[PDB]
Design a binder for this molecule. Structure first.
Ligand SMILES: CN1c2c(O)nc(N)nc2NC[C@@H]1CNc1ccc(C(=O)N[C@@H](CCC(=O)O)C(=O)O)cc1
Length: 638
């Protein structure tokens, strides 16, 4: 296929990509009549500056620019479709034509590519460019309305799907999500591409390239390079990298950092230096070629090119410079065994990582303060609960909005949108927890990074679980699988192990799920309720954690720690004591993380020795009278 053909070329030599199409169009200096052409002569809105309309109004100019770039030495030419969505064309009144413009841009690029391929013998490729659009999902249009968004995930999915329909019907060889200002927009474009590839169309290679705005190393939406790579690698792009907004000397460290984090190829086409006082990126082609050759000799990049300021002279110099350079070899074992989560910053859970705290207090059903703030509509002050959780040591935040008084999806969308507006909250990943899958989808469609979906299970059959898991994989997030099946909630050790194994072998063998993205919850259940059947639950969880960790490769283990101490509510210190003891024994068992009260977990050594012994007796059922003894000990604290 096309992906194999491109991958074969990328292994032997470095590939050169198009260049500054807008810069070439600027030297043409077309006027309003030239932009309109004959067909749009009486169009009610101005079309000057709309470079995408030239594909139907001035095909000759676009074709000549493509031929110039290809004869310069470029191997891949982007289509003139940077603003060819219905949303981007809404400024020009050309919403209905987004399919037509994409089709004609693909055709006019393909004719030039075929002509140059015939004339030179070197096969050329056409990359369908999908622009970032002026609308942002992860950033509010106004400072005073942080939770407000003027565009939704579904609208952008529809627009990008129409654009990609136009591009694929025109016959592009590569799809290129470029100049990503918002990682959520890139995820929406990937979602649309997955819809198209799973409905009718054979897959095409996908090139993803972000944009580091400043020397701070973060995109426009605030995500770092590693976080961006983690977020957008669920679609498995053939190439990843950066473009524009920076010169090579300013882009080199970020390119190295990205190259060391992904097993995909690295594409880098930066601006031709900094703009001068006149506004022209004046870095000469020779200096650009030398900078890209320094990039290539170090093994930093695999695809080179130029963003704004790159004329075909720059492309000729770059192509002749990188002609003899040896390509980058991707690291095949990039963070093997780790679980790769992300918010604004990467969060990797490896085999030698400590216990990961997940903040339980952002739960409507299980936090009195959070529920009190949410039902009043005061999400602004309910964000302070997550702030305190992160300040207190929570590495992941668990979000739950399940209540009959609340509209689930709307509340979860608003809370995720408000979370994204706060930097220190947004750097840690989120845990999407809800019994309704609509709320889970609403949470996944508002997240910038890679989150965890909580509470998926075999409760409603194999087919429903499989469909939900397929949707989660398409969204590309991590997911927790409960030990819950058609017979009910798992309580015995053997039943927990059987349910977890059955869930695991479905996901990996049939759905092809990533084993490092699966988290198993053997259902920590309350003990010491006064009922003798409930006294073995902690032991069952610990043994199930043992067997699951030593029999299911790559699968993590988590659970709700506070569930174990429901019988002793109001007696907080004893609850923290059992939490410490159970955490000690479960981490010795293999519990990788858990939804826990982040700052209220004492270490096993500073627990009071008498209370330590009482909690050990209760949890391990060493004494049939343990629960009443612990209650009496609590009563002695009067
Ligand atoms: C049900 N349990 C759970 C689970 O067992 N397994 C998974 N995967 N996910 C989850 N998510 C929800 C839940 C864990 N979260 C919890 C569990 C318990 C509490 C809790 O004890 N809250 C206190 C009040 C909290 C307060 O106001 O301070 C209470 O009185 O009940 C608070 C949060």
């Amino acid at each position: 296929t096309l992906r194999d053909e491109i991958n074969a070329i990328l292994q032997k030599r470095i590939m050169v990509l198009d260049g500054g199409m807008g810069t070439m169009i600027q030297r043409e200096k077309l006027n309003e009549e030239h932009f309109r052409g004959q067909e749009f002569k009486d169009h009610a809105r101005p079309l000057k500056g709309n470079n995408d309309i030239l594909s139907i109004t001035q095909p000759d100019v676009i074709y000549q620019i493509h031929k110039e770039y290809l004869l310069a030495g470029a191997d891949i030419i982007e289509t003139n479709t940077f603003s060819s969505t219905s949303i981007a064309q809404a400024d020009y009144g050309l919403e209905h034509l987004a399919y037509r413009m994409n089709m004609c841009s693909a055709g006019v690029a393909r004719k030039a590519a075929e002509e140059v391929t015939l004339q030179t013998g070197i096969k050329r490729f056409v990359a369908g460019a999908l622009g970032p659009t002026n609308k942002t999902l992860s950033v509010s249009p106004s400072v005073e309305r942080p939770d407000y968004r003027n565009i939704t995930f579904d609208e952008l999915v529809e627009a990008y799907q129409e654009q990609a329909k136009g591009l694929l019907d025109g016959g592009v060889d590569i799809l290129l999500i470029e100049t990503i200002f918002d990682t959520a927009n890139a995820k929406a474009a990937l979602f649309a591409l997955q819809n198209l590839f799973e409905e009718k169309y054979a897959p095409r290679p996908i090139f993803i390239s972000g944009t580091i705005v400043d020397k701070s190393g973060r995109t426009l939406s605030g995500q770092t390079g590693e976080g961006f790579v983690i977020s957008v690698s669920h679609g498995e792009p053939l190439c990843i990298g950066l473009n524009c907004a920076l010169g090579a000397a300013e882009m080199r460290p970020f390119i190295e950092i990205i190259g060391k984090c992904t097993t995909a190829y690295v594409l880098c086409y930066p601006n031709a230096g900094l703009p001068n006082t006149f506004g022209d990126y004046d870095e000469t082609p020779s200096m650009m070629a030398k900078h890209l050759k320094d990039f290539a000799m170090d093994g930093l990049v695999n695809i080179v090119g130029g963003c704004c300021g790159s004329t075909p002279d720059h492309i000729r110099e770059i192509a002749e410079a990188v002609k003899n350079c040896k390509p980058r070899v991707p690291p095949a074992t990039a963070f093997e065994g780790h679980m790769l989560l992300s918010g604004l910053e990467p969060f990797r859970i490896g085999p030698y990582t400590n216990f990961v705290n997940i903040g339980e207090r952002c739960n409507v059903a299980g936090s009195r303060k959070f529920a009190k703030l949410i039902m009043a509509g005061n999400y602004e002050e309910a964000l302070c609960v997550a702030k305190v959780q992160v300040e207190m040591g929570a590495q992941v935040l668990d979000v739950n909005m399940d209540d009959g008084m609340l509209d689930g999806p709307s509340a979860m969308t608003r809370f995720c949108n408000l979370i994204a507006s706060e930097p220190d909250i947004a750097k840690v990943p989120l845990c999407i927890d809800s019994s309704n899958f609509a709320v889970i989808e609403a949470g996944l469609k508002c997240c910038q990074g890679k989150c965890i979906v909580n509470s998926i299970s075999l409760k409603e059959g194999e087919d429903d679980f499989l469909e939900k898991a397929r949707k989660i994989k398409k969204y590309g997030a991590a997911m927790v699988v409960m030990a819950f099946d058609e017979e009910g909630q798992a309580t015995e050790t053997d039943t927990k192990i059987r349910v977890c194994t059955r869930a695991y072998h479905l996901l990996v063998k049939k759905l092809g799920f990533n084993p490092n993205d699966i988290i198993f919850d053997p259902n920590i259940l309350t003990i010491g309720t006064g009922m003798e059947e409930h006294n073995l639950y902690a032991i069952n969880f610990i043994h199930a954690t043992k067997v699951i960790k030593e029999t299911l490769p790559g699968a993590r283990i988590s659970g709700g720690l506070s569930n174990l101490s429901f019988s002793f509510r109001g007696m907080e210190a004893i609850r923290e004591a059992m939490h410490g003891v159970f955490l000690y024994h479960a981490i010795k068992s293999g519990m990788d993380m858990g939804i826990v009260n982040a700052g209220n977990l004492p270490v096993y050594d500073d627990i009071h020795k008498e209370l330590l012994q009482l909690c050990e007796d209760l949890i391990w059922n060493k004494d049939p009278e343990a629960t009443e003894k612990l209650l009496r000990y609590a009563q002695t604290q009067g």
